Design a protein around this ligand. Structure first.
Ligand SMILES: Nc1ncnc2c1ncn2[C@@H]1O[C@H](COP(=O)(O)NP(=O)(O)OP(=O)(O)O)[C@@H](O)[C@H]1O
Ligand SMILES: *[C@@H]1O[C@H](CO)[C@@H](O[C@@H]2O[C@H](CO)[C@@H](O)[C@H](O)[C@H]2NC(C)=O)[C@H](O)[C@H]1NC(C)=O
Ligand SMILES: *[C@@H]1O[C@H](CO)[C@@H](O[C@@H]2O[C@H](CO)[C@@H](O)[C@H](O)[C@H]2NC(C)=O)[C@H](O)[C@H]1NC(C)=O
Ligand SMILES: *[C@@H]1O[C@H](CO)[C@@H](O[C@@H]2O[C@H](CO)[C@@H](O)[C@H](O)[C@H]2NC(C)=O)[C@H](O)[C@H]1NC(C)=O
Ligand SMILES: *[C@@H]1O[C@H](CO)[C@@H](O)[C@H](O)[C@H]1NC(C)=O
Ligand SMILES: [Ca+2]
Ligand SMILES: [Zn+2]
Ligand SMILES: [Zn+2]
Length: 719
């Protein structure tokens, strides 16, 4: 097989292609992009078959959360396995690799692929996998095997080939195989060592034994083999470790030491809920200028990670930088994993071979949460509710099983111009003159279609929320979707064109703010609402001084486009729309911005119901957003503008947390140009992430297949 050339070639007896999920622990993308030629069998698979540049892991980048994420399609917070070592309050038990509690079905949530196959009339066998040796939802896989890390790989492969020798009735359709290397060698020496090469050569022979075995069984060109990894590897040193003793006078708390630290109380389960978690982050927030970590609360963490809604995730969490560790006391060598999944060193591998997959194709990077949807499509089975976008991975397959469709709108738009005179002043006034700008808001059929072409190129974001009373408001420079109930816009779409050298930019008009004649005063936001609240003040979603002359910016300064913002948050919001937005408009040759509020007080990752919202503006029914999104959209080819682009798009979304203090960025000593960009970049999320938090599906009028649009939806930009 290793000497053979690139080729369904399935023989009689086998009617459907079998799926094998090969896992090589700690096999980073760096290993495949540098040492691939040293691996004869793996190099023959990357050339003939299909492979990605890298496969994005899930935080924390460890075996048990990632392996179980691949088989379920759920985030660690949803499937329960948030860490290899964790504690449950309600069950009052400790989960550990050495403990017997690993076999307890109460820890394991969701439905893995092997069970999904069994519930749909397909047998599933497994030779090692975190969860396969556990009775998830009562049932066990058809051929499960109790874990033993010291078993030789040749015997593991031999028994898997023996399962394929079984007759059609007893013969399983789905398989999984786990390998400890090149992870064990990564901890022993490091990611750039001779030790990992020997382990990489050892996994190559192990994969070689499977392909050579399948060759004599005439299944090497029939089997849909998927060789992937859980995480990557990063070098560590005893000099590159942050000690907690240098931050606290006395340690009276339990900490999960390593790349993903979690602070918990010792007295459990009584003092768990009453433990002052917000105190620890406050005592760790920018204590040193050369600090190698950042303390975070569960909802304060970047939304893209999806690591908050689970009782096992301790409220106080630590975000350690690249190559650096965190320990409780003074009492390391080689390498480790558990860091941010966005990091280059934590990028896993993905390689596939078979008749279902496209031959000699190098696909773009994707998240492990999507593997479950692909596995279901390969086995011809309906998936269980997972967090992966079904249909996103159709570009990998020659013949896609699931054809995705656009998200159905559950709420119809129904605001209209009648007279330019306002019924109620709403305690707001502009010093400037007669009401001439009020008639400019009133646009004819042609003028509406003009702004629905320039500022709305991919169409209006459809409301996926049930009974959401909303109205569409049109302006010459921006189109917005006002939310009648929350008295603020859900979204605001506007295409900023490519500007000149622009050394001096026009400033925003101060003290000028009028009332909207289209929106009814009962559903309108009053300026007196922010008068009583000293902490929160009126902020505009769409910046007025971004398009046109001094007269044109009068449309934004109205009761509409007004959203509640903190005085400290405005420093991040205004600087981004005055310096950064223009800077990235030059690089992309114009940019389409879709911005709005996010309500996620229950930190589940989904949009909040009116009852779910806990904080409102002082003595008013207008809510306060938890986060604010900014979706920047352009094109892959820089020659075209977002208003008129034929081809593939380029996206840069954000989920900026709406916090009363900039304690996350730490603005002390640093000028706005040194921390605003850094925070936005740290809070970059997928288009699917903004969609789930708002209940607004984007890009529905874009002339491209639903499968191709989902690739942009799942896309996460990495710098
Ligand atoms: N199904 C399983 N059941 C129990 N233990 C397993 C199973 N699969 C793998 N393991 C064990 O989990 C290890 C991989 O876990 P990890 O890579 O997540 N953690 P490790 O390398 O020990 O170091 P840390 O950075 O977490 O300190 C393997 O080497 C096995 O010993
Ligand atoms: C889980 O294991 C930890 C130890 O790893 C246990 O923590 C101890 O809990 C007692 C109170 O019950 C404290 O006084 C000790 O200080 C804790 N130990 C350490 C090392 O800090 C915990 O009780 C275990 N939980 C269960 C349910 O087994
Ligand atoms: C994996 O190990 C477990 C625990 O040793 C085995 O489970 C036992 O199975 C027998 C029947 O074979 C039952 O009578 C026991 O009650 C089970 N114990 C527990 C704690 O579940 C299991 O059979 C082993 N599986 C394999 C494939 O070796
Ligand atoms: C990931 O998917 C799961 C399943 O679709 C979601 O979990 C469900 O969420 C609803 C609403 O909160 C609950 O009523 C269900 O009980 C949950 N089920 C399970 C098994 O957890 C989860 O919210 C999704 N997460 C994201 C980020 O999309
Ligand atoms: C558990 O198994 C039963 C079998 O009847 C099934 O109906 C149910 O959906 C399963 N639940 C999960 C969470 O897999
Ligand atoms: Ca929510
Ligand atoms: Zn691992
Ligand atoms: Zn490991």
């Amino acid at each position: 097989w290793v000497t053979e050339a690139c080729a369904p070639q399935c023989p009689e007896g086998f009617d459907q292609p079998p799926v094998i999920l090969f896992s090589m622990d700690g096999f980073r993308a760096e290993y495949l992009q540098t040492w691939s030629t040293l691996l004869p069998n793996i190099n023959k698979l990357k050339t003939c078959g299909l492979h990605s540049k890298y496969m994005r892991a899930v935080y924390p980048t460890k075996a048990f959360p990632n392996h179980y994420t691949i088989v379920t399609g759920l985030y660690p917070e949803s499937h329960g396995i948030i860490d290899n070592n964790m504690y449950d309050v309600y069950l009052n038990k400790n989960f550990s690799l050495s403990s017997v509690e690993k076999s307890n079905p109460a820890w394991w949530s969701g439905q893995p692929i092997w069970l999904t196959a069994m519930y749909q009339g397909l047998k599933a066998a497994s030779y090692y996998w975190p969860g396969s040796d556990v009775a998830v939802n009562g049932s066990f896989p058809n051929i499960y095997r109790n874990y033993s890390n010291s078993v030789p790989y040749e015997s593991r492969i031999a028994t898997l080939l023996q399962w394929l020798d079984l007759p059609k009735a007893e013969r399983p359709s789905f398989y999984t195989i786990y390998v400890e290397e090149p992870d064990s060698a990564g901890h022993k020496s490091g990611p750039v060592s001779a030790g990992v090469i020997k382990a990489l050569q050892l996994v190559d022979d192990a994969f070689g034994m499977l392909m050579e075995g399948l060759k004599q069984r005439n299944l090497h060109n029939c089997v849909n083999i998927i060789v992937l990894a859980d995480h990557g590897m990063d070098q560590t040193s005893c000099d590159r470790v942050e000690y907690m003793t240098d931050y606290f006078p006395e340690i009276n708390f339990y900490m999960y030491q390593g790349p993903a630290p979690r602070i918990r109380t010792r007295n459990i389960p009584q003092d768990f809920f009453t433990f002052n978690s917000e105190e620890i982050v406050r005592d760790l927030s920018c204590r040193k200028s050369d600090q190698h970590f950042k303390p975070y609360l569960t909802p304060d963490l970047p939304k893209r990670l999806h690591y908050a809604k689970n009782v096992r995730i301790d409220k106080v969490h630590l975000m350690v930088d690249r190559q650096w560790l965190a320990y409780r006391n003074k009492g390391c060598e080689g390498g480790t994993h558990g860091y941010n999944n966005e990091f280059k060193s934590m990028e896993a591998i993905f390689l596939a071979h078979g008749p279902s997959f496209k031959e000699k194709t190098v696909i773009e990077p994707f998240e492990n949460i999507e593997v479950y949807n692909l596995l279901c499509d390969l086995l011809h089975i309906q998936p269980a509710p997972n967090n992966g976008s079904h249909g996103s991975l159709n570009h990998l397959l020659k013949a896609p099983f699931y054809q995705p469709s656009h998200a159905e709108e559950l709420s119809k738009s129904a605001c209209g111009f009648t007279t330019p005179l306002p019924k109620d002043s709403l305690n707001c006034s502009c010093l400037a003159q007669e009401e001439q700008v009020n008639q400019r808001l009133n646009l004819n059929r042609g003028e509406v279609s003009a702004t629905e072409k320039t500022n709305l190129p991919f169409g209006r974001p459809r409301v996926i929320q049930k009974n959401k009373d909303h109205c569409l408001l049109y302006h010459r420079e921006y189109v917005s979707g006002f939310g009648k109930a929350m008295k603020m816009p859900m979204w605001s779409s506007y295409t900023v064109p490519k500007p000149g050298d622009t050394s001096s930019l026009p400033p925003t008009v101060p003290d000028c703010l009028r009332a909207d004649v289209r929106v009814d005063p009962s559903e309108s936001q009053k300026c007196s609402f922010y008068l009583a609240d000293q902490n929160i003040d009126h902020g505009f979603l769409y910046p007025p001084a971004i398009k046109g002359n001094n007269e044109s910016q009068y449309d934004a300064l109205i009761t509409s486009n007004l959203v509640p913002m903190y005085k400290e948050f405005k420093k991040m919001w205004d600087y981004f729309h005055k310096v950064l937005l223009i800077k990235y408009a030059i690089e992309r040759n114009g940019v389409n911005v879709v911005s709005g509020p996010i309500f996620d007080y229950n930190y589940d990752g989904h949009f909040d119901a009116p009852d779910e919202i806990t904080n409102y503006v002082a003595g008013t029914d207008v809510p306060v957003p938890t986060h604010y999104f900014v979706v920047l959209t352009s094109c892959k080819n820089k020659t075209h503008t977002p208003d008129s682009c034929p081809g593939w798009l380029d996206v840069l979304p954000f989920v900026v947390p709406h916090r009363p203090t900039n304690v996350e960025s730490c603005p002390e000593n640093k000028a706005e140009d040194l921390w605003v960009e850094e925070r936005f970049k740290a809070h970059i999320a997928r288009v699917r992430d903004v969609e789930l938090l708002t209940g607004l599906d984007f890009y529905q009028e874009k002339t491209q297949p639903v499968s191709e649009i989902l690739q942009l939806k799942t896309y996460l930009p990495t710098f």
